Structure formats: structure tokens, C-alpha cells
Paper text:
Dihydroflavonol 4-reductase (DFR) and flavanone 4-reductase (FNR) reduce dihydroflavonols and flavanones, respectively, using NAD(P)H to produce flavan-(3)-4-(di)ols in flavonoid biosynthesis. Anthocyanidin reductase (ANR) reduces anthocyanidins to flavan-3-ols. In addition to their sequences, the 3D structures of recombinant DFR, FNR and ANR from sorghum and switchgrass showed a high level of similarity. The catalytic mechanism, substrate-specificity and key residues of three reductases were deduced from crystal structures, site-directed mutagenesis, molecular docking, kinetics, and thermodynamic ana-lyses.
Author numbering:
A (entry chain B), B (entry chain A): 11 to 345
The structure:
Amino acid sequence: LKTACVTGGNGYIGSALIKMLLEEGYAVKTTVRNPDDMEKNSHLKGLQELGPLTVLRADMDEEGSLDDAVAGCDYAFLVAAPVNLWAQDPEKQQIEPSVRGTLNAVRSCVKAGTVRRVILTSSAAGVYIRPDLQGDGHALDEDSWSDVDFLRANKPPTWGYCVSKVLLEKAACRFAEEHGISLVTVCPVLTVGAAPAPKVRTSIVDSLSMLSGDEAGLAVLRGIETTSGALQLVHIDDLCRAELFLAEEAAAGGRYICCSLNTTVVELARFLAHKYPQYRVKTNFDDDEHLLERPRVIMSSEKLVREGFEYRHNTLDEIYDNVVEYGKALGILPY
Amino acid sequence: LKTACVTGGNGYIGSALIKMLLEEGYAVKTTVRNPDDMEKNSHLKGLQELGPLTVLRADMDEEGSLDDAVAGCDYAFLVAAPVNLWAQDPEKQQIEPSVRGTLNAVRSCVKAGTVRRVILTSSAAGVYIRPDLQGDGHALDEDSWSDVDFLRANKPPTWGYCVSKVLLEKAACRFAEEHGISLVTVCPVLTVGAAPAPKVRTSIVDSLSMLSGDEAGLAVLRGIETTSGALQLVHIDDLCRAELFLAEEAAAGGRYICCSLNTTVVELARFLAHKYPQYRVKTNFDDDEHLLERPRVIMSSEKLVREGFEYRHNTLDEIYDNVVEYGKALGILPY
Ligand SMILES: NC(=O)c1ccc[n+]([C@@H]2O[C@H](COP(=O)([O-])OP(=O)(O)OC[C@H]3O[C@@H](n4cnc5c(N)ncnc54)[C@H](OP(=O)(O)O)[C@@H]3O)[C@@H](O)[C@H]2O)c1
Ligand SMILES: NC(=O)c1ccc[n+]([C@@H]2O[C@H](COP(=O)([O-])OP(=O)(O)OC[C@H]3O[C@@H](n4cnc5c(N)ncnc54)[C@H](OP(=O)(O)O)[C@@H]3O)[C@@H](O)[C@H]2O)c1
Ligand SMILES: O=C1C[C@@H](c2ccc(O)cc2)Oc2cc(O)cc(O)c21
Ligand SMILES: O=C1C[C@@H](c2ccc(O)cc2)Oc2cc(O)cc(O)c21
């Protein structure tokens, strides 16, 4: 069989990727940091009783820890990454560990000799910090990079996360090219949908905040719109198929935005209020709230599409098709 | 004042639209075919003594008939249309007059020069004839068009009505684009609620059939579900507000489904049986329970809700809040 490595099998996106790879007939090796924690990793046993899944222990911050897991793999999906969006000391707790851990992982992939392609999962946060674009009508593509200097000078919330994505991508791209290994980078927007992982929180807390009523989650969604010009969404299923697509399509190369739809907080609030009447969805925003009626800047996925990929969740109704039941199971929603 | 034209002021939806436009401060001009029939048109005098309403005589089948009425209007609400759902000769009694009357109306709107936007009332019957979708889990949006080929090949009941909506929509859009006039099309599902018109019947006969026991109306409801995959409902007041919203919302464009709730014959029957025990509502079926237990195909109003519209009647109780009294006043219900 063809074998794939997925770092961070207990993560939100990582757990979904593993499930899809197995379904598509791959043998899968995944790393977690504490396999003995079956609260976090029970889905890996569930999947492991269904398909050829291997679970290993590794911390990406330790050089060479990934050597064994990626040995004998055709593809390496580097999903695991530091996600301290709000660290007190971002340079040391988010940025430096991100760059160092990504280089550690690519080094292991090179060492393995068998890895045909590395698939690095980054984020739209490395793309859409663009304070030089004013007014509306803007459309960002893979040539757009988040303004690191602006981020370090002004340090808005989650600035360290945005910087870490920019720096780790460039470090990864340089390392891969200097060692002759093919590297594809995927920059997904906010990802929504059910996954096998039983104890994840991550962005689900935020994407469900209009239904849960959590004001911190609501601030995150507002922050995305304010800082990037829109609220961009993609379904977990489309993200995982996109990663498989980019791994398999030999003609694929370089960076790829993964984004199905550009909306706004107000649009999403209205739609969710309409689709889920049982929740008290606040839709009446009033003035000061610098909220957009329509996107000012959109993220373009034309490169991935013209590459041959097709999204299957193309409306708000389809992007939010199964996340509510997932939120219930995770305890993020009560009922 | 801003001035709006409404065709067919004696019609069910037309009469409700006129009352709402007058309430919202519009000067209104409406056309009827026989203003001297004050049994059908008395509500227009009642409205005329309360607000700035002009009543004119016109038959949409005759080219130019609408010229005078729509002259000086900022918006034109084309509500009047042939409703011979069961014509013996649909081609000549339903389809051709529909296309021709709509083109006549839009031509008059262009000639007026003042019409900023045309709001064309069409029907969900132009959307949900989709024999290619089997199983459940389907959601239809504005890109779904009723299958005219299937309709002409099998000629199910009301096939001529369904075809007329598809053709008049496409002909109208091609004409509007060539003349650079904004045309927005609304495709309501089964519309329910009280209206000023005193002698209308239309779908009220069918939407009240579970209370009246009329088996022809009950057959129409079962037919909607069997042919479209659900029993879709919207309140007259939400439809009228939606039409105003789309007229006034500069960003709005193209076609819009108007649908508050996707339910079933059985669920509606159980709801009506509990709400109105004085009437004898049949809730026990079987075999004939080819009736769905839950919608197989749902009409998605996501485009309209994203545009900025919010439904105010969202439950069966809210959708059926005042239709029964109206049915009494119309003689459709005895008591
Ligand atoms: N969720 C979204 O909506 C979204 C959208 C766009 C981009 N992204 C990005 O895609 C990546 C995955 O996101 P996610 O939502 O799945 O986050 P998550 O649920 O919190 O999972 C993060 C994974 O990374 C692991 N990890 C972190 N540091 C590690 C380390 N030093 N060594 C080994 N493993 C480490 C974590 O393992 P531990 O449990 O041991 O910490 C976990 O498995 C993230 O980089 C995210 O920023 C997410
Ligand atoms: N009622 C619903 O539940 C529903 C749901 C979805 C869509 N719709 C569609 O919305 C439209 C209005 O529906 P409705 O319930 O209000 O029907 P309605 O009560 O029977 O009224 C029909 C109106 O159209 C007029 N009309 C027909 N042909 C005309 C012509 N050649 N020239 C001038 N006027 C003409 C009629 O005037 P006359 O009296 O002189 O014939 C009448 O005013 C219809 O196209 C319907 O198919 C209705
Ligand atoms: O790691 C991520 C991804 C990030 C994100 C949001 C929007 C976007 O467009 C790209 C990335 O959002 C989050 C929000 C959280 O509460 C926790 C998280 O771990 C994350
Ligand atoms: O003109 C219409 C609208 C049509 C309709 C029903 C459901 C739907 O979803 C869309 C349209 O139903 C009707 C039923 C009638 O007895 C008489 C009518 O004149 C009509």
C-alpha cells in the first residue's frame, strides 16, 4: 500500500485527515505526544480497528523525533503545529517553536528518502494581514503574504500566530528547496465540520459561538473579519480532500489557499439564526460595531480550482451541515 | 413620494403587497382587469381612502396595456400572471400567455424610464421539479431549474404551470439584460395568511384543505410533496416584506427563493389537528403514507437571508396565525 504520515493524530484537522486517508486506501502512520491518554486518542483506536493505522509518540519540538514515523512513507502531512494564538510571549511560545518544529519535521521527511511530497498545513493568517489594501473590491491569492512588520509593530490579538505562519512557511519552503524535496503548503481559512477527535476545541468554539452565545468566540469571528476583510469558511471534508488532492496531483506545487466561501459575521449570524431557531442567535448589530454587510476583501481559491479541485460544500448550509452535532458531542453546545 | 406599481390588485398576493406598500409610505398604482366589479375590487377602494392608491384598468395579455400604470413608478412589482394550473391546453392557456404577458409588462417598465427595478413574482414550481435527485439529503437553491423536458414528456398535473414559470423567467431575464433594467425574481413556495382581497381562492383552498376536508385540495398538498420532496410554506407577510426588501436593496440581484419552513403533509396535519380540534383533521394514513415522515428535499432560503432578509413567521403556529379566519371570511371554511 501507499503510506501516509499525519502529525498530531489527536488534533481536529489531523483526526479528520487520518480518517479520510484510511477510507481512500492508504496505510497511515500518525504521531501523538501522549498515546497513553485515551481520553484524547480513543478515535485512533477506533480507526485502528478499521484500517491500517499506526500510532507513534513524538514531539515535533525535539529534533529527529519524527524520523521513525515518516520512515517508509510516500506522503507526509504536517498538520501538528503550535496553536498558542494568545501566548503571553509569542516569540518564544508560538513563533520560534513553529519554525523550529516545521524544520525538524521536513528534515525527517528528507532523511526518510521515500517521501514523495510534504504537505504542510499552514493558515490563511499567513496571507490576509494586508493593511496596505484599503477600500473594497480586493481579492487575495497565493502571492499575498501577511505583513510581519505591521504585526510586530502593532501586535493585534493573535499577531504571534499570524507571524509564525509566515515565517514557518518561508523557512519550510527554503529548507525543502535546499534539500530537493517537494513541498506543498495549504493555507486553509476557518474550517468547519465534524471530525473523529473526541476532545478538541480549537476553532470549533469560535465557529459555533453564535449558537453557544460565547462572547469570546464571537470576538474571534469579529476579529477575523476586521483584520482580513471577510469571514472565510471551508468545510473540514473539503480541506481534507484538498490535502489529498495536492499530495497526489504531481502537477501541484507551491502554496494553495483552501477556502470555499467568503461571507461576513452578519451574513453568517442571519443564516444561522434562520437554520437553527432553537438557539437564540443574535442578529441585530447596531452601529459602532465596525461590521461589514459584505466582504471587503475575499480569499481566492482559483489556483486550487484551476488545478482541478472541486469543493463539495459550497453554501453556508453545506458548510454547517454536521458541526452542530459535533459541538454537542464535544460539550461546546449544551443541547 | 416613491411610487410603486403592482399588477393585479384584486389578486391574493397582489392585494397584500399593495396594503404593505401603502403602510410603508409608498404611493401605489395598481392594475385590475375589471375595476367595475366591486365585489372583487372593494378592498382597493378601502385602501384608496386610507392612502395614495391609484387603480387602473389593464390586461397583461395586450401589448402596452401597462404603459400608463407603470409610468412615473420607481419600482414595478409584477405579481399578476396566468394561474390556469390545470388548463386543458396549457401551451395556449398558460405557457404562452405567461411569457407574453411578462414580456409586455417588462417592456412597459423599460418604456417608463423611471423604473429603477422590476420585482418579478414567479414560483417555487420553477425550481423544484428535479426528478434527477433520488433519496433524501438534497437542498435546492436558486441554481435549480424545473426540468422542462421531464415535464413535457410526462405531463404531470400542473406541468404547464411549472413550465410557464421556467420559460417566463428566462425570457424576462434575457429581455431585461438587453435593455439594462434591473430585474429581480422571487420564487415563493406555498404562501399562507390573510390578505385584503375579498373574493380570492387560489392556494388558500389547498392550504386549508385539511380543515375543510376538501379532497381536491388535499390532493394538491400531497402532490407538492410527492413532486418536490417537501411541503414548503411561507407567510404572506414575509413574502411581501421580502419583495419590498429586494426592491430596496441595491446589492440584491437575480433570482431569490422565498421559503420559511420545509415540512411535510403529515407534520402539517398533526399540527392542524392539535391546533384546531373543532375541525375533523385526518392524521392517520398508511400506504398513501407514501407521504414523507420528514422532508426529502428542502428549499434553501440562504441567498435571501444572506442578502439581509429575516423571516418573522418561522413556526407552523406563526405561519398559520391568521389564515383560518381569512378562510372563513372567504367562504372556504364554514365556521
Ligand atoms: N481549526 C481551524 O479552523 C483552522 C483553520 C485554518 C488553519 N488551521 C491550522 O491547521 C493546524 C491544525 O489545526 P487544529 O484546529 O486541528 O488544532 P488542534 O485541534 O488544537 O490540534 C493541534 C495538533 O497539533 C499538536 N501539536 C502542537 N504542538 C505540538 C508539538 N510541539 N509536537 C507534537 N504535536 C504538537 C497537537 O498535539 P497536543 O495535543 O499534544 O498539543 C495537536 O495534535 C493548525 O496549525 C491550525 O492553526 C486551523
Ligand atoms: N398563492 C400561493 O400560495 C403562491 C405560491 C407561490 C407562487 N404563487 C404565484 O404568485 C402569483 C400570484 O398568485 P395569487 O395567489 O395571488 O393568484 P390569484 O389570487 O388567483 O390572483 C391572480 C392575479 O393575476 C391577474 N391576472 C391573471 N391574468 C391576467 C392578465 N392576463 N392580465 C391582467 N391580470 C391578470 C388576475 O386578475 P383576474 O382576476 O382578472 O384574472 C389576479 O389579479 C401567481 O403567479 C402564483 O402562481 C402563489
Ligand atoms: O489554530 C487555529 C486556526 C485559526 C484560524 C482562524 C481563521 C482563519 O481564517 C485561519 C486560521 O483559528 C483558531 C481559533 C481558535 O480559537 C483556536 C485555534 O487553534 C485556531
Ligand atoms: O398559483 C398557485 C401557486 C401554486 C404553488 C403551490 C406551491 C408552491 O410551492 C408554489 C406554487 O399553488 C396554487 C394552488 C391553487 O389551488 C391555485 C393556484 O393559483 C396556485
